[PDB]
């Protein structure tokens, strides 16, 4: 399983995915 890149300000990879 791999995380995804959140389009949020920090733009950091997250498993939650936003």
Q: What DSSP string runs through 1-18?
A: ---EE--STT--EESS--
Residue 17 near residue 4, CB atoms below 8 Å? yes
Experimental method: NMR
Could you tell me the two tokens for 14?
């997250």
Residue 4 near residue 12, CB atoms below 8 Å? no
Q: Compute the distance between CA of residue 4 and CA of residue 13 in angstroms, rounded to an integer.
A: 5
- Residue corresponding to tokens 């995804």: 4
State the number of CA atoms in the 13 A half-sphere of 16 facing the CB: 6
Give whole-number Cα distances, 7 to 12, 17, 18, in Å. 8, 9, 7
Largest CA distance in the chain: 24
């Amino acid at each position: 399983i791999q995380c995804c890149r959140c389009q949020s300000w920090p733009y950091m990879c997250s498993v939650f995915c936003c």
